[PDB]
Structures are given as C-alpha cells and as structure tokens.
Ligand binder design. Structure first.
Ligand SMILES: Nc1nc2c(ncn2[C@@H]2O[C@H](COP(=O)(O)OP(=O)(O)OP(=O)(O)O)[C@@H](O)[C@H]2O)c(=O)[nH]1
Ligand SMILES: Nc1nc2c(ncn2[C@@H]2O[C@H](COP(=O)(O)OP(=O)(O)OP(=O)(O)O)[C@@H](O)[C@H]2O)c(=O)[nH]1
Ligand SMILES: [Mg+2]
Ligand SMILES: [Mg+2]
Lengths: 84, 476, 234, 84
C-alpha cells in the first residue's frame, strides 16, 4: 500500500539530474473531490522564476503515479537537453 | 479456451513425479506441500516479527487471518460456477481440491521474505548500497563514483552486465526475496503451481526505464532478481505464461490481503489502551460521514463482541463482490494480462474508512514512530560492521572460503564464521558453476558475494538483529 | 650483543609443556563435550598408550587429567634436562639458536595442539570475545586522542599547573591517568637537555609511551567498563 | 606460538611496496609430509600473467618463516628496481 523505496529514489535521482542543468521543480499534492484518486502537480522553471511548463497527474495508486511523474521529468530533461 | 488443467501443474523440479495420475494421488501431492510449508523454519520465524506493535498480533497470526479470507473467496467462486454448469467446461471438475489449497498456501507464505523491521528495514539496505554502487551513473555512456574497480564503466559487451548488476543490487524487495528463499536457500522443492502463486509482480529487479503501458500496474514493483532469471523462464515455460504475465490464482491472494489491512490494527490499538471501544466507535462514525456493517455489530455487544461481528458483516459484503469481479473478467485473468485489481463503488470506499482512521490515530502514535527510527539505525550499523568482507580481493576470499584457517586475515575470518551455513552453501553452489576462464568471473563473484551478505541480514528476527548489533558494538 | 641468559631456556620449555592441556580440561567443565568424547577425539587424532591410555583406565573427570599430566611430565622432563645438559657450552655462551623441545616427544605436543585449535579455539563464544576486545581498545585510544594533539607548551602547563582555564576537556582527561605513570613521565622528561634540538621528539615519544602504559595496565573487565562509561552508554 | 602482529604488518607492507610497481603476488601454504615443518610458496608475476620467479620456504616456526618471506620479497623488489 505504501510507496516503494526504489520509486522515491528514482524520483529524487531524476529531480537531481534535471537540477544539474540549473533548473528547479515545485511539487504539489492533494486529493480530488469525486474522481477518488490522488493528484500531483509539477512545475518546471529556471532560477530566475520564469515558468517553463506544468503538468498534473491523477491516480489512485502511489507507485504508478510516482513512476509517471518520474518518466515525465525524464522526458522534460531529454527535451531540454536536445537543445539548450 | 479456458482450461485449468494446463495451469495446475503438479510436477516438481527435482525427482519430479512422472506418468499419469488419478484424482486421488494428485490430491496427495498437494498435501505433502502443505506439510512441508507448515513445518518449515521460515514459517516458525514469523512469530518473532512484529506487525505494528512489538495479545498483539504478529506476522504469523496476521497471515492466519489472510488464509481464512482466501479460502472463503475460492469457495464462493467454485460454488458460483457450479450454478452455471461451467465447472466441467473449464476443466475444474477434478481439481476443486488443489484449487483452494494453492490459494491457502500462497496466502500463508506471503510475508516470508520481509527483512527485520519491515519497511524501514528495506530502505536501509537500499540506501547503504546506493552509496557504494551509484546506479544512476551507469544509465548512459561512460562518465564514475563507483567504489568498486570491477563494476566501473570503462568494453561494450561488459558494460551491460556492469549496469545490470549495479541496478539490481540497489533494488531489494521482500517479494523478490520470497522466491529466492523458497527455492535456493530452504530447498523446499515445491510444485510449479505453488511457486507461481507467490509471484506478485513481474518487473525484473535490473529494469531501468519506462514500463509498457499495457503492464504499468503488474510491473509497479520488482518481482525477481537476476540470479533467478533462469528459474523464472523455466517456470513460465511450465505454466504457459507469456513475458510479464501473472498466474491466475495470484489475484485471489491479493484481494485477501487488501481486506485484512487495517481492521486488526484498530483492534490491537484498543488492547493497548490508546482509546476505548466507545471512542473508536465515535471516531468511525465521525469519519464515515456503516449501518449495515458497523451499527449491527455495535448493538450486538463489549470489546470482544464488537469486532467479532464487524468482521462477519464486512466479509458478507466484500467476498461476493470479489467473486463476481473474478468471474466477470475471467478471460483476461486466465491470459494473465489483466492490468487492474479485483477491488470505485461503495465497497472500495468502505476500506478507505478503515484506512484513514488507522493512519491518523494508530500509525501516528509516538511509540510506533520511535521504533521505526531505531530499526533504520540498527540495519545500517550491521552493514558497516561487515564492510571489510566486501573490501577483500577474489583470491583472499577464495582462500577464506577454502582453507577456513587463515593466518593473514584474523578479523575477516572471524566475521565469516558468523554467517549461517545455508547461505555459505548457497554461495558455494552458485560460484561452483560459472566458467572460471572467462572475463566475467569477478563481476559474478562480487554479485554473489553481495547477495550472500544481503541474505544474512534479511533472514533475522527483529529481536535477534538488535541483540547482535548491541553485542558487536561492545555495548552489551 | 643479542645474547640470552642461560636460565631463560628452562622457562621457555616450561611454557611449551603447559600450552593446551589446561584448555582441554577447561572445555569439559563448560560442557563443550564430555570426557569420553574428548578421549575419542584424542584417539582419532593420535593415529598415547603409555600416557593417555594409562590415565584413562586409572579413573572420571578429575581422575583422567590428574594422571595424564603425570604421565606426560615423566616423559617430557628428562628429555628437556638431557637437551639442556648436552648443549651446555652454547647455552652458557648465549648463542644457542634453537629451543630445548623432532622426535616422539615433540610430536606428542602437536597432538594436544591440533585438538585444541579445532574443537576449543573455534567455539563461537571464544571467537566473539576476540572481536569485542579489538573494538574496546580502539575506542579508548580515540577518546584520548586530544591529549596527543596538544603542543609542548600546553602539555607542560597542564602537567605543571594542573588547573588550566584554557583546556577544560583536556585537563579532565589528564587526571584519569594513574599517578605512577605520570610520575614516570615526569622523571623521564626531567633529564633531557632542555636547550637541545631533540627535546620535542623525545617529549612526544615519552608522551606516547605514557599513553601506552595506561591502556596496557588494565584488566579486561575494567577497560570494558571505562569504555562503556566514557561513551555515555552506562 | 601464534604469529606476531608486527611480522604480518611488515609482510603486508612489503607486498604493497612491490604492488606499487604494478606487480602481483600469489600465496600458498601447507604442511609437509615428514619434515614436520610448515611450507609457504610465493610466486611473483606481472598483471598480464607472465610468471617471473617462484620460491618455497620451509620452517616449523611462524615468525621466522614470515620474516624469511618478507626479506625475500624485499630482495625481489630491490632487484626489480635496480633495473626495470
Ligand atoms: N507502522 C506502519 N505500519 C503500516 C502502515 N501501513 C500499513 N502498515 C502495516 O503493514 C501492513 C501492510 O504493509 P504495507 O507496507 O502497507 O504493504 P504490503 O501489503 O506489504 O505491500 P505489497 O507487498 O506491495 O503488497 C498493514 O496490514 C499494516 O499492518 C504505516 O503507515 N505504518
Ligand atoms: N583464544 C586463543 N587462545 C590461544 C590460542 N593459542 C593459544 N592460546 C592461549 O594462549 C596461550 C599462549 O599464548 P600464545 O599467543 O600462543 O603465545 P605466547 O606463549 O604468549 O607467546 P610468546 O611470549 O611469544 O612465547 C596458550 O596457553 C592458550 O591458553 C588461539 O588460537 N586462540
Ligand atoms: Mg499481508
Ligand atoms: Mg604462558
């Protein structure tokens, strides 16, 4: 039922990997009204505070939700290192 | 075409029974397995591991309640199919016996691979290795913070094994340890159908990347290690399972654990005077927003008479729903590609009621929180004590395992004799098969040494690990 | 130069005779095995009749070793005396490069040697105490490490004034040392030429010797208690 | 009776000193049949596996045997640093 350690470690590793490009990530988490699934919102912006993009993920399982967040962060890093 | 005769396999790996068997002797095969499992040292050790509180339930008493719920879901499924006259069409005419026994033994040994102190004992093993192997530095082309010369990226055919070994060693899971314990260490030699009932997840431990969207739920956690890759392929070939597929009977065991998740802890809280029965009833009434399940039990009692009827009331409403969900989605479960669980209705919302009350009033108690921090410190200290064993060379460790009386390593040799004999025998058997004249021997030897170190730590009771940690630090 | 005293050879031979025989008897008193089991082990390891068999039939625990010791002494002592007498000029000169004890006499001691290392010295309880003792001594040396990091002037002020307002932690550790070791240090450093370029080296050597004397002069039981108390455990 | 700590430390120091010249040492130890003395065999070879030389020492005392091994290793190091 509880989040697995490896998923949290991978999420932190992705966060640090994208932080190595002088970036930052904000994290928000809550529970939705009627969809009966937890929601996590991520925002990516640079140090000066210029927001680049945001995303929101909804799921009733912690493991799947964290994996989706981690792979979205990895895709963001990949796209941001394709150029710039 | 659904045919359960191709799934219920009564063959073994060693000295397998060959030839045609009747319905009576087939049942006798599944009773010896029960005798082996019940009278095993792994099951006896479950009474010295804590669930939450160190008349309180242990893991042995908890797994006995899950076993009863599993029996009841299987019996409801079997009885409902006979009403539709589908028992003969599905191949279950002469297999109603083993069908329940497999579920009952899978529910029993569903927590035999958990390390001491549980979840925080699992994290401590992962972080300590993460600092020595740095798996995140082997994802791409050579960069390297690895502390081992042999596992550092430098050699395309050899780097894949390096990154696989580095990723696998930092992913310790109790379910993956259960398969290894049941086959390599204990050498119980169970049937193929029995082993498939404890394969909860299908993601390999060395997997790095994104999982396919068709199996994003069945591969949420690691399922098996790299040292069991050959054994899992044989199991899949024996049970006719595709890659990343599940055994049909595993779903029933998963639903049984979800029903018995927090209800026992709430009863255990009252016995420790955290609150009273009336206070718990008021808390449940406030959190709910019940009449058929909780109110019926409340007016039928007072402590050993409130839960005794609440359990019955919730079972009579949850078991038929699980049976109907199992029956409706039968082709997908039989194929092994069902990407959901049996349990978004009034049934699933009820479990969250018990879930929310337990996390707020029981799991947040100061006494429960303190034990979680102490357990994390104990496991980290034990791994540091045995660190000199991992710093030796191949020749030195070979001399240590062969001679057993070394005059050059007094400290290292004495630590070696503290390991259990079964783990040492498993290590000897594992390394006694690899090609010696190969450029892959050091990597496999280091992997097996790390696995041998991990087996010794995870096979302890909470009480034994604390005593050993205190004694090895010259405190007691 | 590099010569030995003639009487030292007799003391060396006495220790070699009483090397493992007592430990074998102590093992039986701790129920590691029984007298019959030990006799069977000795019979298997030997390959005895005049020494061990005579004692076995003359008993049962306090009657087996009591005659085994006599039987081995009556066969080992005359050999040592003859070896001492034969090589007398070399022993008197102090240049004898061998020990008193390659015959049936020296092979007998290896019998007791091999049984003790395999069945007694390998016991888990004996092995555990060896690892705990190594940890205790290492920890005690780390606690007193600040004493070795001070300077010559600071340590001189510490040993002279005994009430220092600049080193509260270091001064309190200094008072735990025994008075005899401190007196020996004072006498040793009270003789070297002060106006010499060798004073700091000798002072550091004597300070290290003073630290080593304090650790080695403890009983096992006292060192464990001090280690546990200084770590805020007891 | 048991080996002294200083002798083992000196043996390890000599082994590391010769290892600083990208070399290696193999160690073998056993008990002889009738000479009634322990035997230790050392082999010196480079990383590629080309054996340079070997030696065997026999003695019934551990301290003397280890000192002989250490001084032979030191002589090997001296001879191998006289040239090459
Ligand atoms: N101390 C503590 N115990 C918990 C907590 N949540 C659940 N538990 C206990 O642990 C049991 C379930 O373990 P979980 O860690 O939640 O997960 P799991 O069922 O072992 O996980 P899987 O093997 O992935 O299915 C529950 O029945 C409780 O007894 C928690 O937050 N704190
Ligand atoms: N625990 C343990 N004790 C031993 C061992 N060997 C000998 N002893 C004990 O220690 C005694 C002798 O000490 P040793 O370390 O062997 O050597 P020694 O006689 O002190 O040495 P020297 O001063 O060089 O002559 C024996 O009589 C035994 O009581 C061993 O392997 N383990
Ligand atoms: Mg469970
Ligand atoms: Mg003595």
């Amino acid at each position: 039922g509880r989040l697995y350690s490896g998923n949290l470690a991978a999420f932190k590793a992705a966060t640090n990997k994208l932080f190595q490009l002088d970036l930052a990530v904000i994290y928000d988490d809550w529970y939705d009204a009627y969809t009966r699934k937890d929601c996590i919102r991520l925002r990516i912006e640079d140090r000066s505070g210029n927001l680049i993009d945001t995303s929101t993920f909804y799921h009733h399982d912690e493991d799947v939700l964290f994996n989706m967040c981690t792979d979205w962060l990895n895709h963001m890093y990949d796209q941001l290192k394709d150029w710039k | 075409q659904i045919d359960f005769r191709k799934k219920i396999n009564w063959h073994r790996r060693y000295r397998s029974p060959q030839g045609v068997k009747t319905e009576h002797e087939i049942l006798r095969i599944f009773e010896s397995d029960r005798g082996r499992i019940i009278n095993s040292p792994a099951i006896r050790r479950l009474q010295q591991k804590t669930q939450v509180f160190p008349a309180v339930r242990t893991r042995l008493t908890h797994s006995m309640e899950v076993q009863q719920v599993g029996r009841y879901i299987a019996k409801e499924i079997l009885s409902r199919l006979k009403e539709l006259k589908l028992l003969e069409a599905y191949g279950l005419d002469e297999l109603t016996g083993p069908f329940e026994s497999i579920v009952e033994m899978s529910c029993l040994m569903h927590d035999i691979g958990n390390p001491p102190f549980g979840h925080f004992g699992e994290a401590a093993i992962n972080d300590w290795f993460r600092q020595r192997l740095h798996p995140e530095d082997a994802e791409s082309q050579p960069l390297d913070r690895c502390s081992v010369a042999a596992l550092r990226l430098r050699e395309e055919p050899l780097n894949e094994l390096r990154r696989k070994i580095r990723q696998d060693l930092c992913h310790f899971e109790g379910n993956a340890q259960g398969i290894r314990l049941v086959h390599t260490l204990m050498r119980m030699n169970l049937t193929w159908a029995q082993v498939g009932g404890i394969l909860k997840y299908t993601r390999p431990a060395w997997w790095r990347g994104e999982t396919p969207e068709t199996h994003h739920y069945l591969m949420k956690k690691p399922g098996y290690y790299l040292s069991e890759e050959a054994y899992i392929a044989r199991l899949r070939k024996e049970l006719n399972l595709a890659l990343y597929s599940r055994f049909p009977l595993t779903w029933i065991m998963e639903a049984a654990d979800d029903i018995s998740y927090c209800v026992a802890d709430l009863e255990d809280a009252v016995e420790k005077r955290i609150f009273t029965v009336e206070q718990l009833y008021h808390h449940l009434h406030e959190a709910w927003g019940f009449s058929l399940v909780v109110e019926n039990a409340w007016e039928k009692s007072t402590e050993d008479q409130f839960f005794m009827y609440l359990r019955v009331n919730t079972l009579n409403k949850l078991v038929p729903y699980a049976a109907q969900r199992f029956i409706d989605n039968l082709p997908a479960i039989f194929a092994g590609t069902f990407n959901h669980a049996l349990l978004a209705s009034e049934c699933s919302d009820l479990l969250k009621l018990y879930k929310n009350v337990a996390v707020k009033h029981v799991f947040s108690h100061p006494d429960v929180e303190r034990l979680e921090l102490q357990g994390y410190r104990v496991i980290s200290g034990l791994l540091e004590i045995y660190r000199p064993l991992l710093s030796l060379s191949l020749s030195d460790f070979t001399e240590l395992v062969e001679k057993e009386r070394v005059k050059r390593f007094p400290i290292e040799s004495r630590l070696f004799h503290k390991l259990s004999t079964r783990h040492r025998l498993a290590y000897v058997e594992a390394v006694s098969k690899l090609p010696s004249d190969s450029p892959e021997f050091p990597l496999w030897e280091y992997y097996y040494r790390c696995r041998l170190l991990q087996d010794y730590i995870s096979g302890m009771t909470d009480l034994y690990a604390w005593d050993e940690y205190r004694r090895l630090m010259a405190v007691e």
